[PDB]
């Protein structure tokens, strides 16, 4: 019932503790996430990144706690009334023992996407994360929830000039994930972090990661 083994890049970023945002382990050191999360409070001190955590207020085992060595918000992130622009964040994570995470069953990095490569709309992708529901489940949802969303397409996006094109939209029927949480579309059949959750989950608008690779490299190196 601890499903992060499926999708174990998922980083539960808390704020020391309330759950702020999901994240995705791109590297042992670096959790990728949405910035719109932290901009509200931009301090590395503030946030604790969990990994291998399946559950919101229960520390599941295998879960690794990490401080954010460095918080990195996109110098260009813009929060529209609606859309978030360059909503890519970045988190160098350190454990309490001063270390990057270690790959587990429960904790892994998600491949970053091929340089500038995007799934066709209609691809299947997954948004992990507890998600904020009205109608009260009983994975309630402490339990980290993967949800298969189908990529829709830009024009498909229904919001006006959002497409940032540096953004993916995806929606399910019905409709889940967590802002900052990943979206993973199986690429080349090997799993990729296709986009960060920016707005949504009326499809979800995902920061297209493939664009931000330069940013990522530039900040993770």
């Amino acid at each position: 019932f601890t499903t992060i083994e499926n999708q174990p890049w998922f980083a539960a970023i808390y704020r020391r503790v309330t759950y702020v945002c999901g994240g995705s382990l791109i590297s042992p050191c670096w959790v990728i996430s949405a910035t719109h999360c932290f901009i509200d409070y931009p301090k590395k001190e503030d946030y604790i990144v969990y990994l291998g955590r399946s559950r919101l207020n229960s520390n599941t085992q295998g879960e690794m706690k990490f401080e954010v060595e460095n918080l990195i918000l996109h110098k260009d992130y813009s929060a529209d009334t609606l859309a978030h622009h360059n909503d890519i964040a970045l988190l160098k994570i350190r454990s309490k023992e001063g270390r990057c995470a270690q790959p587990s069953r429960t904790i892994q990095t998600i491949a970053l996407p091929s340089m500038y490569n995007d799934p066709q709309f209609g691809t299947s992708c997954e948004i992990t994360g507890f998600g904020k529901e009205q109608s009260t489940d009983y994975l309630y949802p402490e339990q980290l929830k993967m949800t298969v969303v189908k990529l829709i397409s830009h024009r498909e996006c229904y919001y006006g000039s959002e497409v940032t094109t540096k953004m993916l939209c995806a929606a399910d029927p019905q409709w889940q994930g967590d802002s900052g949480g990943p979206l993973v579309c199986s690429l080349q059949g090997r799993m990729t972090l296709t986009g960060i959750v920016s707005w949504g989950r009326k499809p979800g608008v995902y920061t297209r990661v493939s664009h931000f690779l330069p940013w990522i490299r530039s900040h993770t190196k």
Partner: antibody
Amino acid sequence: QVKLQESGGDLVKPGGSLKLSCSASGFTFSRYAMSWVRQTPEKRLEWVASITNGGSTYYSDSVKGRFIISRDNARNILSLQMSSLRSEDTAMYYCERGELTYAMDYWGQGTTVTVSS
Amino acid sequence: DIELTQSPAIMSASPGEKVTMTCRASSTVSFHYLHWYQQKSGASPKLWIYATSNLASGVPARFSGSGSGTSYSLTISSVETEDAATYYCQHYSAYPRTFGGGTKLEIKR
């Protein structure tokens, strides 16, 4: 321990209309979605319709349009208003707490609905 | 149209047995929303497993929820006689039928 009481399961003429009540006690109605399911004669279980706590409603392609799920959160009653009833709809009508996406934790004992003339 | 085929439609045999019925969707569905209900004969579907591998209160440790994507399974580790029931796949991502035909578990005696 959350009881679920369908009622108004009854005979009704083809094309006719019937409304099942489901009294929700033992848990906080306002919080939960409620879904209706019907298990047929042949026993295939059909999600009829779901209604989010919010009153937002979702219906099985099977009955959408000719069914309206409704909830009084005042009086904790999931209501399934069926109209344009076809022989199809003849079925054990089960009141579920929860809804499709997250499962239905609790099911009403089920009220039966025969749609025939 | 993302069905949930569910084999076997009906399944059998002995208490102490370890039986597993499959939800096989195809066109793959999230596991978190993959649900198993169990209808005892003449009573109503109890929720059995939710999110695939989660046990609704009361459901005994025997049953366990395994699966991901297209293929999900319900496993009684050891069938007791009170397990005689039909077990339904259910998933919101299954159009038009969120439910599977179910597996009748016929406990052998």
